[model samples]
Target: QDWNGIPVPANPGNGMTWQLQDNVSDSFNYTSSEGNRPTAFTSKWKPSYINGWTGPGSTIFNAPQAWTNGSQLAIQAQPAGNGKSYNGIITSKNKIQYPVYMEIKAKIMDQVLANAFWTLTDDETQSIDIMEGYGSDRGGTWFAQRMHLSHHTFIRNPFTDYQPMGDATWYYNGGTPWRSAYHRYGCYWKDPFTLEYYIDGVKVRTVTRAEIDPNNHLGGTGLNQATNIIIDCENQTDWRPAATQEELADDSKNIFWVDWIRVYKPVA
Candidate 1:
């Protein structure tokens, strides 16, 4: 409830505690006096702006290589063995609301691509992945936590079932190798009933609103009900392990870093 350490008060005295939804706080501290257009750091957070290149072989999504290095806010995924490649963006703006509580501080150096912070759209039953990882072979571990259940009909109306995007959770801070930098990933939703996950502050996994509210195996059921955060850095070549051109010529880049994201609720 308070990082398991009894030090609460972001707005609390326990009525349910937890508060802070769009109170606005982005520590990227970016500036070029204001416009070098990394979408100007998503223009104070309206999210989704779209950049360039796509398909046949032109990959680059919300390009500009995504920047802001001092307070940490980076994204660079470059490679274009002619087929084209480049991707990265800073997301949010679906308006976050629910039985939610989110947190993010990041890191990823390269398993080739995929550095995410979850919650998806297009009504995919309501997605949630909270933290994702790739690069550095992932065996060295730094994030590979996921949750996406899609098979609806009111999520099967319970009684159980599973698939369509759910499962691939690996939480290990064992020997301490959290990508060597930023750490803290969390998710706690109660919209469709229970969906909790955290790292660095413990509480690894807990989902049961019918345990992903399953049964049909494929329409939608990621639980919670409303989502839209998606901070990105993707070029997921089927989830990584394919980079040639002498392994990116030793400097062609691949990185991910973010330093803030705070959302809370409960204390009514």
Candidate 2:
């Protein structure tokens, strides 16, 4: 494994001094109106067939400046209320790099709550599904996370192939729903070949490039591509649906929330 980064650090001087580059500089926080999550009697986000949204059947954005699925994306309670998710895309008027770290304070509702922060390159090819969540009380109590980044699997798997030996079932409390609370999660992408995960400021998992591809690497094009971040909470029930009135309070509207998302890099 060379016990380090990619390129194997050529043994020219043999066990010589090394350094980690400073990559992260800009951190995107969804403080702007377009990216902020809705709270309190949100009649705006919860659109109906009367509105321009897909008639409450699905949670898709019909415009660039409005939200229409409070339940699926930002449910204040049972999340019954379809697909209202906080949108946090790339805002770097320039570019973002790899070998960087991303930290965020994540939280949602009790049973129907879920969280995810992922990326997509400009080409829309290079991609990554960094984090996601679902609760047991809603029949979807599972935490899904992956790093096999690429441009292929835009909405699902990167390649739809092997799973790359994972560690997905950690965040969810088995069948029990997660109590509402914010947890800090991070990633240290040492290179296109190596990545490490941290939860609550503690090391939880590490993935190597080889582990990502026991067959052959997909490539480093994605690592260099200008990547954008995203967050969503889907309640398909088949995957992680909503709860009944008995499961959650009747007046559960503003249940979902996120404090911030911060990125870090090696100190320059």
Candidate 3:
């Protein structure tokens, strides 16, 4: 979930206004004799814990939901539970509520597969995915959006109707990964809503309110609805393929690393 901006705060401090949900720590965010900010980090606030994860939760990132950072983070590519996976999330915490805009900055280095952003375990509510990076090979990357009407009713819904997942979107092949360091990325949620993508603070892609959203396509329109937002680089069975051994060996053995996330809301 991090290349530059991660750790979306739920009730962020230091004049931080945006509400962050699921956050975790890696080699970043720590405190000891050092104080203020430490070196060792964990994923106490990360969403991998709730999903009954194996590698993401244990192994390296044994962090809580508060190991948020401002500069660096870790990302994994080797098969975690099934294989290489990346997981990220944003859930209202410390009594934080939902239905807000969220944004962040990130850059992917993974070669085999990349899952830049995603949502999960939603309580039968509308869900949205800004972008899901899948290696820089497939032209660019893609994203999907959908409204999970109801998780319960969706449980019985066929794999073709209930909760519909949106279409797989891609960048203009104007090329992706504009940079390797850090770039801004964001998403908006609201009435007559939409989602957007940017590079170096420039708008690149925009998605408007559409019914044929992901929820409708995934055939689970009502499943996992109204849930918190979770994003990260994960290797799910359906979503992304496990990272290869050669790729993992060639690449840095670091897990997902996120910088910070900000939410935007309507103001008078």
Candidate 4:
């Protein structure tokens, strides 16, 4: 099936009949002339963090750093002055609930900055990290080749985070770096309690309620909330240091390329 000239994924797993959710999806065949500004596709995306939270570590989520060139969306991590980097984020205008499948064709930047595609509730409590990857070997060759998949439940007031403790990372065994090319990263948010991950159309890892909310913190219904899709670059200083001035200056290595994003929901 096809929607707006973009090929749709025929199956979203579970043999379910699915329909594209255009409100939160994009082919990215549009333009945004200015950086740190909104895209031409206004109804579907906003080129900034949902809540204006700059970003983690030494990166600031700058809208001017995100723009589309009529074919793909590019988010860059460039020098922000004051010893920081200006990264970018593009968030969905609408929220996606459970029983949905979300996927993106993207290539990570070959810098220390993180390439992330994920979802989060408005209140910043529930989150599912569909794809979190490091493109460069600045962190480690092994770490750069693998994808980090996980979820988080937060207690905002006092600041407590609940997350999966098992091996939540995946990678192909022969030192295949994710930054080497564009790949499809997908997630089936089957229900509040189940999440199935896909890499280039193949089922990779599945996480159940038992593992997602192991301590029953959410009282059995884990991650029960609608979430906004977010694609961004981050400087997670805790895991890896901020990108150097040299790295940020290299346009070829600092831009995150998103070919497209497609979302689907089970047909009623």
Best candidate, lDDT: 4
Candidate number that wins on TM-score, 2 or 4: 4
* Model 3 regions more than 4 Å off: 1-44, 47-49, 53-70, 79-99, 136-157, 160-168, 176-179, 196-199, 212-226, 236-242, 250-256
Q: What C-alpha lDDT values do all the predictions have? A: 0.54, 0.41, 0.40, 0.82
TM-score of candidate 2 on Cα atoms, chains taken together: 0.56
Best by TM-score: 4
lDDT of 3 at 160: 32
Candidate 1 lDDT score at position 18: 76
Q: What is the C-alpha RMSD of each candidate to the true structure, in Å?
A: 17.2, 10.0, 8.4, 2.5
Count backbone clashes in candidate 4.
4
Candidate 1 residue-wise lDDT, 1-268, digit = tens: 2133422222223466775665433666554212464544555553243222242123455446566755666665566676446655656644575576777667765445566676654443455667766545442244333222222323334534343344535555554545566777777765565666776556677766655645634344345445567667655555354545344344434667776666777776
Q: Which ten residues in a row have the lowest lDDT in candidate 3?
A: 143-152
Model 2: ten consecutive residues of lowest lDDT = 1-10
User: Which lDDT tens digits does candidate 4 get at residues 215-264?
Assistant: 65566668889888999999888668767888988998999999888888
lDDT of each residue in 1-268, candidate 3, tens digit only: 3433543322223554543344322223333221332423322234353445443321222223223444544444443343443333323322212345566555555453444544444433334555555443432333211111111122323323232233324443434343234445554443323444443455555555454254444343322234454545544435334455455455453234455554544432
Ranking by lDDT: 4, 1, 2, 3
lDDT of 2 by residue, 1-268 (tens): 1112222121213454324322322121222233443442131122212223231122332223223242222323332233443221222222356656665555544544343455545555444555555534334323322212222222224534333434442444334333455655566655666566666666566665555544433443324455655444333343445444454443343244544445544542
- Candidates, ranked, TM-score: 4, 3, 2, 1
Residue 156 displacement (Å), model 2: 10
lDDT of 4 at 226: 84
lDDT of 2: 0.41
